[model samples]
Target: HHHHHEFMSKTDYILRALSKISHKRWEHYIINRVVHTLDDPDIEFVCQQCIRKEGHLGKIYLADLLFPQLNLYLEIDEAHHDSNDARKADAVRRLDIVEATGFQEERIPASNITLSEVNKLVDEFVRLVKDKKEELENQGLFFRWDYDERYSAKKHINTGYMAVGPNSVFRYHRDALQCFGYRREGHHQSGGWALPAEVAQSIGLTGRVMVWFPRLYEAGEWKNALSADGNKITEQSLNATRNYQETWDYRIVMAHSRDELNRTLYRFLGVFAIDVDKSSDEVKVFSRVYSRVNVYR
Candidate 1:
């Protein structure tokens, strides 16, 4: 019994040490630097110490970024594997379980590193995160540090008369609902749904209306619009007549208050509409409408 107690005590100590080292390293390497420096880091890295579950139960373990997005996990292994084969096997088993949980594990062989090397490694990791974030932004995923503020700007810019007419009319409806404290319902096969009907009705054109606009249904066309390669198409070559206008079925409302008007305008600005005719085979001049609206419906 005494031997068993000693063994258990040692196990607990090792587990605690591993957890402390892992969390400290992660906080030092990724969290502190990313939070302090980057305007808006898209990746979220977290440490999960000894998750008690049916699978992946171990110490010094981490589950990758959760909310907003999932990227990857980092694991720190110490000298427990040297003395006990069972402990090593258990670690492997836990890793397998973690991988099953949709995390790609990156092992840090810290056992060989000196204190100064550890610090250097942390700096290197921070650099890696910065590089990764910049790469994503370059790929067109705009990472707003204060998403709410950016979204507010988007909402305000989108609600003017000219903004309402051609490219952003549909987006105006959706963002208007959001500005008025409406939550979006789940997306449908066609698109997405929004709430806050009363607020929307109070501020903007309320009731179902058939707004006519050109609709591009070709998969190739849509793919081109969304892809970076398609951004190279020239505007002069597009057939404007082939772009057919379709009626959108949604409720509309007019603004009752200044706040509502501002919100509606921003909503208009936030909407994303693809410039269909802005690209040809060579030189692409995307003709996106600035936030200006002239109401006519």
Candidate 2:
């Protein structure tokens, strides 16, 4: 209960995400420069997002950058990419990526461009991003980044979609609770909240319990985790079904992990309803009632 850790900065979050899948210095430089220059805290981005491989089942293709709301991808070309073989291979890969994801592609010739030219290109790219944001806003499809300055309890509850790394990550369990209507002083401390009848009614939820389950938990008798295929949740123990029951309409489940700074943070998974047909006394099976919450993070 006394674990101490700081909330990661946006820069740190971006770097950590990139570190998991890439080590290219040039890519880092471009991303860092662009992100800082844009200076917009609400911008959401994804690194090394994999596109499904069609013919080659085992092999996969990872895009350099992706902006989900914008439906855009950016590719940074290095010096070696100019070779004939690399060029041909890239052409096929780009074709496959475009065909599969249908996201607009933005390419930066990092190898051939001078530093000043790259800066200018990044400026232009930022302008394009702004323009796209405006377009999406005009279309009434704009949503603030879930954890940014624009984030508020009302906004999150209204939107009803928590992002993966881009927005859903919280510095503390209490912060996650605040995304709902809880504003008490100390952390809720329990696995989650069983909102009071009035609170649940105010939030428009029929059920009272909302769970924050870390896939990686402390050494304990119970094991609560998402299934390997990530479609369902298994809550195991003698008391797994104690406070929770199948009769409740549904429970808000936020799957968490200790991946960032070894501190536990929650990611809004989805509304789960008990699978009574598959449950037992020792374990409770919860089937996702909604489309999978963004699991990319």
Candidate 3:
């Protein structure tokens, strides 16, 4: 099931559609820069991708750009999303995309899509793409090369990287932090925390460490929950707390390694994890985790 259209025409069509939607002259340069910023051979961005809609336009969701490999969708909105009745229609349409595709959705207001944030946004995009691959592998969904074509698997993360408010924040909370920091306090949400952990005292993470999470995928389902944008936990955001109950406190440290623990020589890691624990409640002994000092710039 392969479509063999010339790349140039399709790319041009997509880009033109994007230009029309954005109504911005700078979009071409901005998007070109973004494409280079991504710099990943594995991804193919299909702009103006058509998704069937109900009564109105047959093409329901014309994704500004789509990642065939990542199953991610990108949409740019303008004042068109603001009018009186527009929000409701937009909201329903949005939920439809979320529910039906279960893909991560990146909604960017046309106003904020500018040149100044290109570098940061591109970094966010690259991290997300990598994170998706990492999570899929963790969820037993990693596909090497033609992995998906032969196996027939569905990619969980289906959305864009940045539209607003720093894309998605990541974290690596110690798996079992319930005992030390549950002061009749609050939270449900996606994942990750930054409070002090007594157990981590020995490992040096008294107040949580800045993690690189190099040894992921083989480590925990926390990443999967994260990549899925917490679609898994929203079902029970208000359930009564249970004793020995396993709670997922996700982390938001940048991707790095243990050596970066001191905040010097390097800020990245190349280590890989084969398998770790995704255990619950019961205090974990000999836990293989790392923490570090947050670098200030």
Candidate 4:
């Protein structure tokens, strides 16, 4: 039951294709550059669905992979993306939608990459994978199969926690605010201190520190939670987070993988610490003393 009008659009095609594939090939899709690689080099990582079920603007095609560690969406854009004005306009709108939803975009010209280039790209991809794996390991972060379940589920439950700090301080939230086009007027004040004015200012220090948990489903009898503006978080935030969690939950419902759990926990801590300025003198002192008393290893 495909809607031909929507199907004709590349965004719609990609969205629909992702939806069909996510369920069938969840394992194949890599988020944030993580991949399930095989010795066979011809295989490319595929996304299940670019848009999550909780997405408000219908199906928005998100980047397939996260980047750097889980970096880059390898999209093969046809000439129509550039040549056809209407199609190009549609493409721009689609890109805006995705960007508004808090994701980065990277476009690769299919025309530029010949059959020979495909092989080279594959080799480059493998090298990227190895490098990313090494980078994560060096940072005391490693890929774990069960990350989607524990971390994602927690993230959903604690959606409010996701929005920690001012946009100027936290780049992730800053990017999100910019995406939403939030504006700040005058010198923003929090705790009697004039926090420099910014477009997206959260209510309290809590807002500055917590990450926003995204709901996967639309509001109904099933789940009910409102956003900062009293709208449902589901309505405002894109469905990608929920989709990522759902796929993750499916992957590791039975037994949580220790490797994955550790990686995710470390990653969460890394983000959390960054948000809190853990390098500050007070935090650093506490960390050093704590490490001496209780060895991490």
Candidate 5:
């Protein structure tokens, strides 16, 4: 229903989200039905987000459906989740996620349920979502999730970090950098942009370099690897010069690649700082400093 959006169409958005959780039949079913039924043009929804708990060994939780502006998430519970042990496990998982995100959780029972029942549940949830939006407006915290306004360079400077959704992926390198006030021509193909001192100070970042990579690559003996846990990233120096060093206070790491269509895109990862003790002369270990960009304030 929402094909008018820019950059990524709603149909393509749902397809991409469904592809991530292809094995979860119920989840896919719910996403297809509910997302297609959504009529709001501005409601931003991200599917299958890997939310990492900060300072908790980077333990990750996969959110089924996240409504960024609404600060609410929907989890479709399959039959497996009905099991005693699974429910108990989900309790702890839910608690941890709530503590970390401060977003309310909404559950949808979809396991072996009839289509009519699922539709009824979807109706109720959708109604609640509309009500929540109104509630936020009444509370004076509601803001339109306009792409340009929400990700404006001015907003980033005022907030001290680029605000992006968890699945914030841009079609072009310049589009991504535009969120942070880098309006110059794209000279570097590697997606690396050095911010001017004035621009850097405006964003409260001590570092001058803002880096974005489509993917990790191995260059002869040097390489980069995002840890399996998705927490730490080891970036190796190219040539004799270290690309990432301790001098830079923190680098806003925007990571990613081309989608199935071979379009180069960058995804917001996080702000990272060099782990001096854990890093060596050849390869630098960078740990996350501020997990911004996931939640848009």
Candidate 6:
């Protein structure tokens, strides 16, 4: 866990959660099987992202799998779901989710089913996505993610960091999320974010991105500087420079912050790094983020 926030692997989360339950035999088995079959970059179906209630008090429920790609919630049933009560509860839960998150959901019975059988239903879901994608191709709807690697030869995902200062735009509790991601704490980060090495291959960006962080209720402080983390040079790096005629030293963020907003995009694309022609060499000792004040949302 980083910064007291836990980030667990799929296996770790399921195993740890199941350890506390008395009736995890069927749920565990089914979830494991289906998770294996549906593993893909675009399809991140987690076991317990279910049972969301909006207001103060309501019935609490848990779903077997929350598949965001299709806006579908999958649940399993043993002997307990044979009653009429289960249907009503499921409907209420579905209504709550729709009202809260603008999503469509459906449950699958675990009385008896196979991964192939589930895949058949998934095929239908994919067909609908394709059709809707065409219909709203120009509308720029915030459709869910795409899992098929070949679906888009090149896919890009965007995330922003805060350029918080005081007096005007950049400050403490502002939008310095990237600094916190790489173990830096509190305001003012002079080091540039550790974007993926692949994204680095396409560097030369001078554009801006939006940034905002937690609302500060307490006193605020801004350093206007990044803490020092002295440089490191390796013979391996020298070898690369000698061979490729170019080398770069970067101290980028290896993992994202534990906050929910920074989760979806740790790494999402690819670019082959080769010895393309190079003339000018560019290097900055350190850099901090700077975004327009009212431009960030």
Question: All candidates' lDDT scores?
Answer: 0.34, 0.57, 0.35, 0.28, 0.61, 0.33
RMSD values, in order shown: 19.4, 8.9, 18.4, 18.5, 6.9, 18.5
* Tens-digit lDDT string for candidate 1 (165-220): 11222223334444444455632223233433454354454443322111112232
- Go through the candidates in order and give the clash count of each: 36, 0, 16, 28, 1, 9
lDDT of 6 by residue, 101-152 (tens): 3344555555566767755655554454444444554566434443232111
- For candidate 5, what is the lDDT? 0.61
Please report the candidate that would top lDDT against the real structure. 5
Better of 2 and 4 by lDDT: 2
lDDT of 4 by residue, 1-297 (tens): 553222134344334433443321221232222332433222223342132212453333433443322333444344442333443234332221111223234444445555565545555665665665567668976544321132222322223333211011111222222222224433221111122223124322222222232222333322322222111122222233332211110000011011201220111111111212323312111110000010001
Per-residue lDDT over 1-297 for candidate 3, one digit per residue giving the tens place of the 0 to 100 score:
543322234445435544544443444544555466666545556454433222232224445556554667665554553342342344222222221143566655556565566555655766776777678768875545432221111121222111111111122122112222423334323333344454334333344432233222223322211112211110111222421433323232323212111221111111112122533333221122222122211
Q: Which candidate is the best by TM-score?
A: 5
C-alpha-based local distance difference test score of model 6: 0.33
Error of 5 at 122 (Å): 2.4
TM-score of each: 0.29, 0.59, 0.33, 0.32, 0.68, 0.33
| Preferred candidate (TM-score higher): 1 or 5 | 5
Model 1 residue 32 lDDT?
Answer: 40
User: Which ten contiguous residues of candidate 1 have the minimum total lDDT?
Assistant: 255-264
CA deviation > 4 Å runs, candidate 5:
1-25, 36-38, 47-62, 79-102, 112-116, 139-161, 207-209, 212-214, 217-221, 237-246, 258-262, 293-297
What TM-score number comes out for model 5? 0.68
Off by over 4 Å in 6: 1-25, 53-57, 79-100, 112-295
Give the lDDT ranking, best first: 5, 2, 3, 1, 6, 4
Worst 10 residues of 5 by lDDT: 91-100
Candidate 1 Cα misplacement greater than 4 A, ranges: 1-43, 49-70, 81-104, 142-297
The deviation in Å at residue 126 for candidate 5 is: 1.6
Which pairs clash inside model 6? 42-147, 162-175, 164-170, 164-171, 165-170, 165-171, 190-287, 194-252, 194-253
